[PDB]
Write a protein that binds this DNA or RNA. Structure first.
Ligand SMILES: Nc1ncnc2c1ncn2[C@@H]1O[C@H](COP(=O)(O)OP(=O)(O)OP(O)(O)=S)[C@@H](O)[C@H]1O
Ligand SMILES: Nc1ncnc2c1ncn2[C@@H]1O[C@H](COP(=O)(O)OP(=O)(O)OP(O)(O)=S)[C@@H](O)[C@H]1O
Ligand SMILES: Nc1ncnc2c1ncn2[C@@H]1O[C@H](COP(=O)(O)OP(=O)(O)OP(O)(O)=S)[C@@H](O)[C@H]1O
Ligand SMILES: Nc1ncnc2c1ncn2[C@@H]1O[C@H](COP(=O)(O)OP(=O)(O)OP(O)(O)=S)[C@@H](O)[C@H]1O
Lengths: 333, 333, 333, 333
DNA sequence: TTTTTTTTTTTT
């Protein structure tokens, strides 16, 4: 009743008839050669921290993918996301933070650089409405970056009504693994960054390596393209009120799984309290090891205003004058 | 059959249709711009102790979050909570202590300043009725500050009936990590202070730094917004019974994680036995280093009643005459 | 009205009348003797990794079968499939990758050895067009190897439109166990490799053995003929820029079910970041155990450039000169 | 006008007039007394595996019946069927394997003992031609054993042309329950073994016992006469490559429904990779329990070559000398 | 007629 034994005989007619037949129902761009598929070239969007951009390898987060960040107690996993929101918003793109922990005070965020009139914030109770407000945003609109914070706090609906301390086994993962399969396949058709910053909790029963995993389930880690781990709680004291007080936290960002460039190229980053991640104070250490500034215990030798050995080393004049940044940024590139 | 490949084209109609579609099911205030979301301005409520209030930076506990306090054996973690109840109760707000240790002697508590006929005390046995009596209080009522003390002693139900020495691995954190997910997402819809004070316990296997952690688990610290640590057990002997006897403990309050202002600005506080925290003796040290009250070993030089060098330094007239505090509290801002 | 008692009396007329009866309606090769049927001889295509071809026993994936690969987080289950695409594309055969995770960046792919203008990529949304685009490809054309990435990401149609977190019991397996029954019987009339690389998620309720299974359902395993599990996360630091940084990952491929050779004959494999599976540095270890290269901690003594004890051991001369490989591959046979 | 009310009065002429009337249109071999019907004495054909031949009780599969076997992933449900094919082919019998998964590689099967130019294989697509090619073979010829593997792969005709994932409820069962009623009533007229090996898939919604059933439908079991469940996946390491490597699989065969002997009489069996089921290694565990070989941890004491405690215990001499088996297999009666 | 997914530390 049908065609006979399909012996392997590569007739280009016998492939082009099928490559005409499977487009009468599914459009013109549902099967094509990759060398004419120019959309799969990973467009890159930067992050301000040149340490993190030279750490990622390709120079920023890949577009159309999912990145997740997690680190321990008060290590600025919110601040890197806020800096990325300001970075993606600066070059003409609309973003929409949504919150879970009810954590983003706007007066803190306004000092970093993110605007306030262009942040479509939300306050969901459950994850059932906490994720469709991202779904209908992405799959309809043309936003460029939308984050959801603290994915241990997307509480499912079936125990926002019940009692306390009962059996709800896997009832977080059975929402997260399903909403990821619904959401994160319709992102590459839009090429929009989506970040889910995470938590840390511990297991029981270990003889090897890691005692610290993430909640939400294993399904989040497989779909995520670039993972970031942010650790480090040592402190630095500056010349705050010309004396010794705490003015700087110092963390460390290591990239553990990446799909565009080799991972485990960790970076080193400093941050002051309130003024966000200091990009100019970041610039000095990464220009020191390339020796475009000469590192010495008495006199930083090279250009831009005869530094010395204070604390506001370069920041006393290149925060005063712009347009010295682009001769250094592409130069260290 | 649906909308086709969603090309990135920033049409404000193509976002405004979504910003009409996602409000027919979740009301009018489920997504809006932050520049018109004036409710996220952090309402600040002070706490009487001017050293703690200048120590936080913002000037009080941020209204609508969770704060936690812990310190070692008998250092007054209860007294700062009681003083916060009195401060939130002074300006027209119903408060509700509940106990776990069965430790609040009311005759002590009446002398600090909190009333007794406006305090919804309870006696929960386990955590099962221990936090539903907080949940149905917060998520229904309009209270302004509730506390639940000693979260090491919210014993779970599954071993309030069994023998002693039974394997119950994780059965405190497996209650707390779900109880906080039930509570601390529905606090910001009422903007109500909730405090959980804590005990300190040690670990085994140490090569770096801290040998003292907290029980309850890692889920409590992440959702907590402002932490406070209370240490210090030196004593002071005053003119008690005209004699060198014990009248005063002296503790040191440090802020280790904050979300509204830079942390690690610790204060210095005194406390007398029975009279609660002493704000007047707290006032002299913080007025000394700004020299509104002049520091001298023979004669405290400035205004209000010609101090001298006794022990009741300023307290012998400002406890007897009011309207001298308004020229001091806003003046030291 | 019909034939009488069919007593067993083996007349070859009484079977040859049936073997001329049942072929006038169903062609000539619907039933024949197996010893005159040379088509059941399992034609084997290699995979480049000599550890894998000495591991599989018969020297590669057998044609006309379905293989699957699964491993934990970021262990190169994509990379072995890419190397198989390169091996099937090298000796004159058209291949067609398709994606589900929207994962394969082409700039990474062009480095391993796969061509770009001879790859029929696709971007399906649902599993509906996810598998019929494989069915119409195999059952019509004459492709030689076609893979499908991440069969846990082939979401069915009936909940690509529904809400989040609803009753959708078995709706992945109820597509997979039917589409496999429609697909995987028409492969052996064409003898074409089909690879379905997979995921890993856990169960609940365990007493014995395995807590890590696969999604998709039980039907994917049973029709699969050759299974591969790829584990391992140790690292090796090479002489990257005369610095000890990360340039080498190391996995461990084990074969757990086979139908052409005994199972459990696991293999060892290294991988560098970007150059794919390094077959050259892999060749030295499998030549060590047969001692055609003399393994010594000071001087690799045998032929081909008189190696020594560096890091680029053999690749410093056989990546510069060819035809030393065919006197080695059939030599280690 | 007809015969009157049939009063019960057992006259032998009143029975013999009916028992001559009802045979001139239905033949003589349609009704007879049981005590002379020598066909219903169940002729038994053995199975090679002596533990299975003591497990069935009657010493093999009863002829004229339909037996079926099923077990989970890779427990050798193909191998027991191939061994039964070789056992029926050994004593003068022509057999006809047919395949559904297109799974029997001939080079594996040639090692077990089944001849290759005497196996009428077929390659069906649908179940429509998949079962009539067995029907016309059984009902016409005088074949002695014929199997059809994997009855979850006999896909019906009505969706071999349709799309993927449509409403086809019970479309497998309405083929199977009808073709079994057409086929398996004409087996007692020929006394031919027919085996249908099976799969295992899981039900949803349970409160008692078994969560695992078989596909194909319910009407397979009612017509089946002997069922067998084949589980067990633990391994044994022998002296392969004078090394403890994987050379041995060990399963467990139970009989759960039988119509000639009581059920639940399971057996134990071993299988090596490539050489099939080992009958000599099967003989030792069944000869130890009747102490024809004495079980001792240091010296297997009894006859046949003064065994000792190696791994090939009996295989060092009865692999080369025959006719010591005939004084054993009848001896263990 | 077919599975889907983990969760939490305790103490010298
Ligand atoms: N706007 C701000 N003003 C002052 N200090 C801040 C501000 N934001 C953050 N910090 C502090 O600086 C650090 C950076 O913040 P985060 O890394 O986000 O803290 P955290 O450990 O992530 O806890 P979360 O996730 O914010 S609840 C922390 O130590 C904060 O206490
Ligand atoms: N009402 C009171 N009258 C007299 N002494 C008091 C009173 N309340 C507290 N104290 C003492 O003053 C100090 C302050 O109390 P706390 O810091 O609460 O003691 P503690 O170490 O916290 O133990 P807990 O948690 O209160 S049971 C302690 O040294 C108490 O012994
Ligand atoms: N083209 C590439 N460039 C740089 N690093 C790569 C590239 N491909 C893979 N890697 C890395 O090398 C390893 C091999 O990749 P994979 O095994 O495919 O990762 P994975 O664990 O399988 O996750 P998936 O399935 O690819 S999303 C991983 O650690 C990747 O981060
Ligand atoms: N000819 C062979 N050569 C090597 N190994 C074999 C061969 N036949 C079977 N095996 C292996 O030995 C075991 C017995 O085979 P089977 O019982 O057929 O496996 P299975 O679980 O039944 O899967 P199926 O039914 O064959 S698809 C399995 O673990 C096979 O991997």
């Amino acid at each position: 009743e049908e065609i006979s034994k399909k012996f392997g005989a590569e007739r280009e007619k016998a492939l082009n008839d099928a490559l005409k037949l499977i487009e009468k129902d599914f459009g013109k761009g549902s099967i094509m050669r990759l060398g004419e598929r120019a959309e799969q070239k990973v467009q890159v969007m930067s992050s301000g921290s040149l340490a993190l951009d030279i750490a990622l390898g390709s120079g920023g987060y890949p577009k159309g993918r999912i990145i997740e960040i997690y680190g321990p107690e008060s290590s600025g996993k919110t601040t890197v996301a806020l800096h990325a929101v300001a970075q993606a918003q600066k070059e003409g793109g609309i973003a929409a933070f949504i919150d879970a922990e009810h954590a983003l005070d706007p007066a803190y965020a306004a000092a970093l650089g993110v605007n306030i009139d262009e942040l479509l914030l939300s306050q969901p109770d459950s994850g059932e409405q906490g994720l469709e407000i991202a779904g209908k945003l992405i799959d309809s609109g043309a936003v460029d970056l939308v984050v959801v914070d603290s994915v241990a706090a997307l509480v499912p609906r079936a125990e926002i009504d019940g009692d306390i301390g009962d059996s709800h086994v896997g009832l977080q993962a059975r929402m997260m693994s399903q909403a990821m399969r619904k959401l994160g396949a319709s992102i590459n058709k839009t090429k929009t960054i989506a970040i889910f910053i995470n938590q840390l909790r511990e297991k029981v029963g270990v003889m090897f390596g890691n005692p610290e995993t993430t909640p939400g389930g294993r399904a989040l880690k497989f779909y995520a393209s670039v993972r970031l781990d942010v650790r480090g709680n040592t402190q630095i004291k500056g010349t705050g009120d010309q004396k010794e007080t705490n003015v700087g936290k110092e963390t460390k960002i290591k990239v553990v799984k990446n799909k565009v460039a080799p991972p485990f190229k960790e970076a080193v980053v400093e941050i002051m309290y309130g003024e966000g991640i200091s990009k100019t104070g970041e610039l000095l250490k990464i220009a020191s090891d390339l020796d475009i500034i000469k590192k010495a215990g008495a006199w930083y030798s090279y250009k831009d205003e005869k530094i010395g050995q204070g604390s506001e080393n370069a920041k006393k004049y290149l925060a005063e004058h712009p347009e010295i940044f682009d001769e250094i940024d592409k130069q260290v590139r």
